[PDB]
Scaffold this active site. Sequence first.
Site, PDB file in Angstrom:
ATOM      1  N   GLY A 247     -14.706  -5.834   4.987  1.00 60.65           N
ATOM      2  CA  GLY A 247     -15.628  -6.515   5.884  1.00 60.65           C
ATOM      3  C   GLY A 247     -15.910  -7.956   5.518  1.00 60.65           C
TER       4      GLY A 247
ATOM      5  N   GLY B 104     -12.066  -2.798   8.483  1.00 58.80           N
ATOM      6  CA  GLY B 104     -11.764  -3.215   9.848  1.00 58.80           C
ATOM      7  C   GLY B 104     -12.967  -3.357  10.762  1.00 58.80           C
TER       8      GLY B 104
ATOM      9  NE  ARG C 121     -27.569  -6.081  -3.912  1.00 56.70           N
ATOM     10  CZ  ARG C 121     -28.052  -7.011  -4.733  1.00 56.70           C
ATOM     11  NH1 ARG C 121     -28.240  -6.735  -6.018  1.00 56.70           N
ATOM     12  NH2 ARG C 121     -28.340  -8.218  -4.270  1.00 56.70           N
TER      13      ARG C 121
ATOM     14  CE  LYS D 297      -3.947  -2.083   2.429  1.00 57.27           C
ATOM     15  NZ  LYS D 297      -4.974  -1.929   1.359  1.00 57.27           N
TER      16      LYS D 297
END
EC number: 4.3.3.6
Lengths: 256, 263, 256, 255, 256
Positions: B205, B144, B156, B72
Site C-alpha cells: 500500500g 493492491g 509497529r 516471486k
Amino acid sequence: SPFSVKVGLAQMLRGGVIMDVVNAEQARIAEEAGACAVMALERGGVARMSDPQMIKEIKQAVTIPVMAKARIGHFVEAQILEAIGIDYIDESEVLTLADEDHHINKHNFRIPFVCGCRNLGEALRRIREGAAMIRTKGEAGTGNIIEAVRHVRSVNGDIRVLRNMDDDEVFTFAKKLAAPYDLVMQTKQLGRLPVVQFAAGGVATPADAALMMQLGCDGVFVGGDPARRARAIVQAVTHYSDPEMLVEVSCGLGEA
Amino acid sequence: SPFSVKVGLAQMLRGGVIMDVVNAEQARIAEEAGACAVMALEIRAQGGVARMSDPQMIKEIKQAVTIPVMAKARIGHFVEAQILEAIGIDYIDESEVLTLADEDHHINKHNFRIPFVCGCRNLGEALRRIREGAAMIRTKGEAGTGNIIEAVRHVRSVNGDIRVLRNMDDDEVFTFAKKLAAPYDLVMQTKQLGRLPVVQFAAGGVATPADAALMMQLGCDGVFVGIFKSGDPARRARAIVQAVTHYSDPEMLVEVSCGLGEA
Amino acid sequence: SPFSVKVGLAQMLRGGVIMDVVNAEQARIAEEAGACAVMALERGGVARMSDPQMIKEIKQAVTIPVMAKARIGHFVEAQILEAIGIDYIDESEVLTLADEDHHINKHNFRIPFVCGCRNLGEALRRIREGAAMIRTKGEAGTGNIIEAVRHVRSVNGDIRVLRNMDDDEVFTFAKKLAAPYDLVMQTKQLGRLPVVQFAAGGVATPADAALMMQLGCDGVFVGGDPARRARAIVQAVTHYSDPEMLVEVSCGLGEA
Amino acid sequence: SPFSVKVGLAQMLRGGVIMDVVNAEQARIAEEAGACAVMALERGVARMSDPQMIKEIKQAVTIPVMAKARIGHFVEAQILEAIGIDYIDESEVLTLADEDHHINKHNFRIPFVCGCRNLGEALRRIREGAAMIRTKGEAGTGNIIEAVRHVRSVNGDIRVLRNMDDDEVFTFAKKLAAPYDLVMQTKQLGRLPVVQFAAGGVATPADAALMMQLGCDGVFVGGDPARRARAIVQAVTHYSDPEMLVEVSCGLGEA
Amino acid sequence: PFSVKVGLAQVLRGGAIVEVSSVNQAKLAESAGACSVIVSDPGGVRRMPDPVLIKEVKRAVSVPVMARARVGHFVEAQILESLAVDYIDESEIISVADDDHFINKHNFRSPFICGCRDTGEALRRIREGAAMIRIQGDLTATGNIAETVKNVRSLMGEVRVLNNMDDDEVFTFAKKISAPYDLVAQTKQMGRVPVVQFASGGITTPADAALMMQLGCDGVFVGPDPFKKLRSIVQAVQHYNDPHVLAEMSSGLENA
C-alpha cells in the site's frame, strides 16, 4: 492373484503423465507429446460416462492405454466400459456421484480401477474395494495445486507415521483412519502405498508436475499451446529433479 | 555459514526501494529512478491463479538492468524456487501475494544458495520464516489497495515486540518464545541484537513519498512498491526513492511530493 | 508554553465558519463570503493528504488562514504540511485512517492541530496528544446533522456533569472516560473545553449552523448557489441568536 | 511538594518487613525481630481497628505504626490521622466501603499505602495520593502464587513502558486506564515513582527473598512466631545470599 | 556445562527413585537398591522441605539425594543448591509459585528434573535447562497409572513421528508443539529425547514399573510392608523383560 496382476498393470504407468482428451485429435496430440495414457471424456449439468462411440474412436487412434471415467458407485457404467476393451476405469468423483454411500465393488471386474482420495484412510478403503491405482485428488478445474499438495502430504505423512509406529498402536490407528487393519499393516511393511499413486487436480505447469513427483507421486493426471505444454509436463515428470531442464521446458510456455 | 553470507548479501539493499516490473521498459525506468532492485512478475482486481512468472520474461528483465533482479515463487512451491535459482535471479521472494501452493509448509529455503525474502505480519511469523532460511523479511500490510494502514500495523507490531523483548527479564523470554511460537534461540538473538537479525523492509500500500518515508521513520530498512499504477511512473518512482534516502527531511519530502500527479 | 500559544492561535477562529475548498476559485468564493478559514483538499478510494501544489496555490489565493488534512496517524504527511507553511493541520478521520491504534504525536510540531471527536474522553485524549482545536464530528457527506447534535450534546453534557461533580469522584470519572486526570480537572475548573470547539458533519443550512452555535460550539466546518449559501451560513454563525436574520439569509436559498 | 514529602516518609522503609499485629505483645515481638514497622488490626465485616488498641500499640513500640482503613472510608482515615498514626493502609483486605471510589488521599497529611494487581491500578492509586504501593496477591492462604503474578505484572509493564516508542505511550495509557502524566513519569524513572512492597501469602524466608529478587522494596507479613519473624527479616536484608537463606530457613517449624 | 548435567543424570538410567520423608525411609529405600531418594516432608500449600530434614537424609545415605522446589520458585532452588543436593525437582506435585514462568535452570550448577505430559512440554523444560524429564501422570496419590501411560505413549509416539518426518515439515511441527526448533531437530537426529526420561505418577506395583520400562522409559519414580514392595519394584525395573522374575516379585505383596 488377480488383484496383484491388476496392480502390476498400473505399475507400467509409473513415471508417466495421463492426459484428459475429448476427441481423437487430442488423443494423438497427447500421445505425440509422450503421455503414458489418455483419459477419454466428452467434457453445470450431470456428468456421466462418455459415449462408447467416442471411447472406441480414441482407443483406435492411439497405441497407449486408454482410460475412461465411471460415476462413483455406477457399477453398470463400469461393466459397459469393461466390455468395450478400456484399459483402465476411473471411478471418478469429478463426474456426478451416482451413489452417495457405496463405491463400485471393483473386485467384480477384470479391468484395473483408478480411484481418488484425499487422505490415507480413504485410499486404503478404495484399495480394499479393489482399486488398483490411487490418485490423490486436490480440486478440479481451478489450476490451483494447493489441495493436491495437502492430500499428497497427508497420505505420505501418515504413511511415514505408520512406518515407525509401535505395533501395538496400529490397531487404534486403523480405527481412527477407519481403514482395514490388514491393509494398514501391509502399508506399514512396504513403507508406501500398496498401489501406484498419482497426483491430480490443478497441475497447470511443469513446475507443478515436478513438485508432485518430488513429493513422492508415481506420476500425474492433467485435465495457450497444448502440444507444447503437454511435452513440457511430460518432460517435467521424467526429469523432475533437474532444474536446468525444468527451466528449459517452462521457458516461453504461454498462458496457462 | 552460507546463511551468514546470504544475510550479508541483503545488507546492500538498506536504504533501497524495490519496484515491481512486468516488462523491460519498466525495469529500465525503475533503475533510472534509482531503485535498488526490481521484482519481476507478469491480481486482486482480476483473480485467476497467480504463479511464478515465465522465465523468458525474467531473463529479459535480468538482461535489461544491472541492479539485482528478484522474482516471486508461490508459498511452499519449492520447485518454482529451484527454477528461479537455476535461471540465476539474485533473490527469490516466496510471496504471499501469489496463490498459496502449500497451506501448511513454507519452502525450505536453506536448501538453496540463492537468498530468500519472506513476508510477515508480526515478530513470530518473521522469526519462523528466518529459521526456515529467509535472509530478508518484508512486513506485508495489504496488497493492491494503495492503503498503508496494515503495513503500519505490522511494522509497529514487529518493532513493538522487539522493544518489549529487548528489555524483558531473561527468565521470562522462554515463555515469550512459546507465546510467539518462535524458536527460542532466534528470539534471544533478537533480544541481544535489539532488532531483526536480518534486513527488514516495508511492503503493502506504499503509494506516496510520505508513505515510504513514514515506513523508514518507523524503523524499516527500505520499502517494496507495486508506481506504474499511477499517473506518471518515472517521476513518482524517483520521488519515492528520494523519499527513502531523505526520509527525515520534510523540506525534501515536500519538494518531491510536489506535482506528483494522480497517485 | 508552546501549547498555550497554539491554543491561542485557534481562538482567533472563534465565531467563524471554515469551508472545504478544492481549487483556488472556491477558496476565493469562500473568503469572499466571509469564511474565517479554508480547508484545502482535492476531494470510494483511499483519501490522502492533498498535493502540496494545490495547497500552495490556495495559500496564495487568500489571506485567511489555510488548513489541510493529514490521515490519522500519518505524522510524515503532517511534517510535509508543516514544512509548506500551512496554518493548521487537520488530523482528519474523513481521510483514510493510516494508523488504527495511534494518532500523530502533535506536540512534535509547531503548527496547531485540529482533531475530531465524538465524546469528551476522545476530545481530551486528542488534546493530551497535542490537539489545539477540537471539532465534534457527526457524519460526513450526508447533509444530516443528527450525529453532530449527538456529539455536541455528549461533550457539553459531560462537561456540565464534570463542572458540578464531587471532587473525590473525578478520579473514577476520568477512568470511565479513559481520559487524562490532569486535563479532566482542568476541564472542570474552566467549566468548558480547554481548547476551541467547532462542529462538523452535516451542516447543510443556515439553521443547522446557528443550532450548533446555540448548542455551544465556537464555530462550524462546512464540507444550488454556493456563493449565496456560503454567506448565509457565515451570517448564521455571526447572528446565531437572531431569528429575523436567520429568516432573511435562509429565504430562497435553493436546493441544499 | 507535600506529596514528595510523603513519598520520602515511605522510602525510609525500603528494605524492611512490615508485620501485622493485634496486641502490644505481638507488636513488641515484631519489633524485636527487626520489623521496619507494624500493621495494627484486631483480626463478618472487617473495619478500622479500635482507636484504643491502636494507641496501645503506638506506645509499645519505637518503629512506625500503620493501620487499615476500609477502601473509600475517608472518615475512618480521618480518625486514624487524628490518632497520629504514621501510615494509613486503605486496604482491600478489610470490607470494601465504597465500590466505586477510593479515598481522596491528597486531603490527608499522613502517608497512604494502597494495594494493586497491575500497573494501571497502581498508577491510579498514586494519582489519588497513595505514597506507597503494595502489589497484593492472595490473603490468608499462605500461597505466594498470586503475589508473584502481580509483581511480575507491574515490573513487566514498567519494563515495556521503559523502552516504548514515545508516540505509542498515549494509547498505552488509555489501555492501562492510567493518568498519562504519571505514566510518562514512570517511563522516565524506570520504576514506580513510589515505594513498592509485596504482600499476600508470604509464608517463608524463601518467599520473602523471592519478592525482593523480583524487585520489591520490601514485604508485608500477615510454630514459633518470633523465630519466623527474625528469619523473614533476615531473608529480606540478605535476599541474594543463599547461605543465609539456608541458615534462617533451617528448623523453621510448621508454617 | 549443560552437557555435564545431562551426562550426570545418565547414571540414573535403570533405577527407581523413591519419595522419602525420614532418614529411616531413606535408608530402607537405599538398601532396597533405590538409585536415589527424593526428600519431602509430606490439601494445604506444599513447599520446599525443611533444609534440616534434607541434611539428615543426605547424611543418612550415600545414593544421590533429590529435593522438590515449587514451579518458578527459583529462590527455593537457590537454597537447595546451597545445601548441596544432587538434583532439584522443579515439581508440579508441590504448589506452583509462578503460573507463567519456570525457574531459569541454566542459572544453577545442580541438575534439574522437570515434569511433562507431552513432547512440546518436555522440550520447553529442557531448553529452560532441565537435565532430566519425568513423564508425569496423576499428581495425586491415586495408584492409577492410566495418565502416566497416556503421557509416556504421547511422548514416545511423537518422537517416533518426528524421527521419520520429512525435514521440510519439521518447522511447522515445532510451531505446533510450541518447542524450540533446534531441540526438535536434535531430538529428530537422535531419535529420542536428548535427556533421561523417567516415568512417574501412580506406579504402585512391579507390573506397573516394568510396563513403563517396556514402554521405553529410562527408569521410574515411586511415591503395608514397604521394604518388600520397594525391592520388588527395583527388581522389576532391573528385570523388566522377564515374566518369571516379575511373577516372583509380585507374589505376596500384602496389599498395594
